[PDB]
């Protein structure tokens, strides 16, 4: 196919549609829009189910509201016959010639730009009194005290962010959150996560990046010799020696260092097929993945094991060190464990 022309024509033919948004991440080109086939919902104007994905080898317009998935050419034929003919002609026009899109291959990225120096409205956990409510909550979390020097407590999280990244929130409503600063390899904070307190925070539990190129892996500065264990929760990583945690919905293997010795320690849910998908994509790369297939505990995360089933960190480490499998060996445990 011709994905770049597909993206260009999709942008041309979807910009005028209401609730259009050109969501362009460094590897993905997507368009959000209210689907003209269905119209989505009057309440769900911003919750527009019309999506276009052009990052694939072909451009596909999919709407989950009316369940309409189709190639971009079909949409052009059904809605923009003039633009349809334009696209269908120009695709053949450039089809004969060699693809030149690789010629302007430039990187607009930048190095550390918003290096985080100090945290207003934040008091570190080890600096707090033993009867602080957050301290009691983390006692319930059973986090070892020595690592409390890595977590802060705040009450002005929107204010803190707008002091770091102004304009994030139109209102700086005071909000207590657990600020977990995410540092780089050299030890300087490149982002920070406002972990929700109590059962759940009111809104917007998100990790605020200092800049788009900031790291998403927590604890990299504390990585020592030996195998590196990759987990899903920074608090969970706090229970793991040489344990880093990826912070984000995107899982890129290239950005994660220690290709030789990185070990993926994921959740203990054989169900939740997205987990199985992640496991499969990791094993297809021949990566080192830990398997909970022989775990005596049946909780979800390591901290859950500790809190609910009374697991101890040493048991966790010995299970991880004895349950690392790679290649076909990993695939066996993956296959048996999934269901």
């Amino acid at each position: 196919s011709i994905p770049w022309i597909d993206n260009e024509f999709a942008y041309r033919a979807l910009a005028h549609l209401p609730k259009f948004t050109q969501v362009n991440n460094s590897s993905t080109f997507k368009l959000r829009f209210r689907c003209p086939v269905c119209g989505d919902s009057k309440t769900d104007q911003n919750k527009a189910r019309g999506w276009y994905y052009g990052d694939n080898n072909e451009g596909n317009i999919h709407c989950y509201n009316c369940n309409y998935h189709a190639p971009i050419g079909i949409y052009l034929k059904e809605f923009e016959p003039d633009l349809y003919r334009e696209y269908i002609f120009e695709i053949r026009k450039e089809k004969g010639k060699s693809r030149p899109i690789e010629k302007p291959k430039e990187l607009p990225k930048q190095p550390e730009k918003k290096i985080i120096k100090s945290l207003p409205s934040c008091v570190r956990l080890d600096k707090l009194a033993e009867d602080h409510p957050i301290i009691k909550y983390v006692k319930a979390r059973c986090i070892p005290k020595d690592k409390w020097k890595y977590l802060w407590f705040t009450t002005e999280w929107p204010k803190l962010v707008n002091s770091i990244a102004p304009g994030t929130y139109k209102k700086e409503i005071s909000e207590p959150r657990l600020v977990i600063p995410i540092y780089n390899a050299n030890g300087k904070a490149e982002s920070f996560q406002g972990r929700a307190l109590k059962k759940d925070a009111p809104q917007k539990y998100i990790t605020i990046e200092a800049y788009p190129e900031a790291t998403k892996i927590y604890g990299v500065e504390r990585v020592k010799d030996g195998d590196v264990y990759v987990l899903e929760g920074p608090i969970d990583s706090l229970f793991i020696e040489n344990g880093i945690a990826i912070t984000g919905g995107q899982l890129d293997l290239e950005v994660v260092p220690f290709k030789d010795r990185r070990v993926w320690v994921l959740d203990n849910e054989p169900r939740h097929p997205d987990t199985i998908k992640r496991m499969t994509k990791l094993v297809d790369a021949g990566e080192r993945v830990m398997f909970w297939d022989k775990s005596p505990w049946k909780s979800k995360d390591v901290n859950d094991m500790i809190r609910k089933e009374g697991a101890t960190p040493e048991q966790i480490m010995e299970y991880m060190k004895n349950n690392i499998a790679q290649g076909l060996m990993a695939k066996m445990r993956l296959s048996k464990y999934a269901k």
């Binding site: 003209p36 086939v37 269905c38 059904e78 016959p81 003919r85 269908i88 002609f89 695709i91 089809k95």
Partner: protein, 432 residues
């Protein structure tokens, strides 16, 4: 001018009665206009009448659609209104718009065809025509005018029929007077003709002889051989057209000088056509194969045949039949029907061959009930001939023809005429 066309489709009887039958859903757009015409066409199919605006916007529009499409259709219908416009300019502009949109659709389709073909196989979206049939589609878009030409009215078109009579613009005469006197002028253009001889009684001596005869008459001949190689058929053609024994070409009694001189002498004549010989594997060519071959010959060699001689109908295959059937009747009849469809499409006399039954071998006479491949082939054939030289005519270098079937004339008038075969030269001469 879609709004005007629809407004005068709904609010004008004469305009509808004039322009509707040529109208189609693929003419207006991909928006509200197409859906409005869809509703109009649905109502016309259901009730054989032009609906009013009330029928459309209430009884019809209230069906499966989308909010955007419903709003657009309602807006368009509310926008429809009768306007006094002369009923000569309206029809002309409608015809021009229909022609323009037909050209637009044809161009889009051929571009899509090129894109599809450029894509490699296994994703080539079968049922889409190849690049070879790009021009005719565009030509189809050329002749899309509002000309009520459906069928051949017996009374309204006697002049054209008389022109066809007086020109005799269907007959392709033979080089033999004997066949012309029984076919009343020769074989006709869109016809499928069949030869039956048996085993090693003819059936390719006759086809090669007819190919040579049509060649000496300046006609384009395409000899599609299934049971013979590209060179043996050309060798029989050489034996016919050079007055040289076929054995003499093999042993070497003919020098290269004689052959080259005879060929150049034939070339210098202005009454010599082109005998293009093409071979396909036995059982591996259908009517689609022959259509592709005709398209290729037209494109590359600028060779549009008037005679197509297939060496054997029975060892062809059916394009429509997908699973090969052990039943000979249906298979052979389908092959013959496809061949006749090709012949009437290209207006080319399509000669071919059929195998006679085992009982007819070494029989002094052969009736039509001796056809072996299928009884359906004589049903869709146009002119069948039979070769019945048993032993005596072989000794006298003769061949008797019975003319088992004839659509060109009463087959009983000249039932037997004892064709003068010459096997060494692979030709036919009369016994005048």
């Amino acid at each position: 001018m879609v709004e005007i066309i629809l407004s005068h489709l709904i609010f004008d009887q004469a305009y509808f009665s004039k322009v509707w039958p040529y109208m189609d859903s693929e003419y207006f757009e991909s928006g509200p206009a197409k859906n409005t015409f869809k509703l109009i066409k649905s109502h016309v199919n259901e009730y054989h009448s032009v609906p009013s605006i009330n029928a459309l916007n209430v009884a019809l529009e209230n069906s499966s659609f989308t909010e955007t499409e419903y709003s657009g259709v309602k807006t368009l219908i509310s926008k429809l209104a009768d306007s006094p416009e002369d009923h000569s300019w309206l029809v002309k502009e409608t015809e021009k718009y229909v022609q323009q949109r037909a050209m637009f659709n044809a161009t889009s389709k051929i571009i899509e065809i090129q894109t599809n073909a450029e894509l490699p196989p296994e994703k080539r979206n079968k049922k889409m025509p190849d690049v070879g049939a790009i021009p005719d589609i565009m030509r189809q878009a050329l002749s899309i005018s509002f000309d009520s030409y459906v069928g051949h009215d017996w009374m309204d078109d006697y002049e054209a029929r008389w022109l066809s009579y007086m020109n005799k613009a269907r007959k392709v005469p033979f080089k033999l007077r004997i066949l012309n006197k029984i076919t009343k002028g020769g074989a006709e253009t869109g016809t499928l003709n069949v030869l039956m001889a048996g085993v090693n009684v003819g059936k390719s001596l006759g086809l090669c002889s007819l190919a040579a005869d049509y060649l000496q008459l300046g006609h384009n001949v395409l000899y599609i051989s299934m049971q013979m190689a590209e060179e043996v058929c050309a060798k029989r053609i050489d034996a016919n057209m050079l007055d040289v024994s076929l054995d003499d070409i093999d042993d070497g009694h003919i020098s290269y000088a004689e052959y080259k001189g005879k060929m150049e002498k034939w070339r210098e004549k202005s009454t010599l056509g082109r005998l293009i010989v093409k071979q396909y594997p036995t059982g591996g060519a259908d009517a689609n194969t022959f259509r592709s071959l005709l398209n290729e010959l037209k494109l590359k060699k600028n060779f549009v045949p008037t005679i197509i001689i297939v060496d054997y109908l029975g060892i062809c295959k059916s394009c429509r039949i997908r699973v090969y059937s052990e039943n000979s009747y249906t298979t052979v009849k389908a092959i013959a029907e496809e061949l006749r469809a090709l012949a009437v499409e290209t207006e080319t006399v399509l000669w071919t061959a059929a195998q006679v039954g085992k009982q007819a071998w070494d029989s002094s006479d052969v009736n039509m009930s001796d056809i072996a491949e299928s009884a359906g082939l004589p049903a869709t054939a146009d002119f069948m001939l039979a070769v019945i030289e048993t032993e005596e005519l072989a000794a006298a270098e003769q061949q008797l023809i019975k003319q088992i079937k004839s659509r060109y004339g009463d087959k009983n008038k000249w039932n037997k005429f004892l064709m003068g075969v010459q096997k060494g030269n692979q030709k036919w001469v009369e016994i005048e």
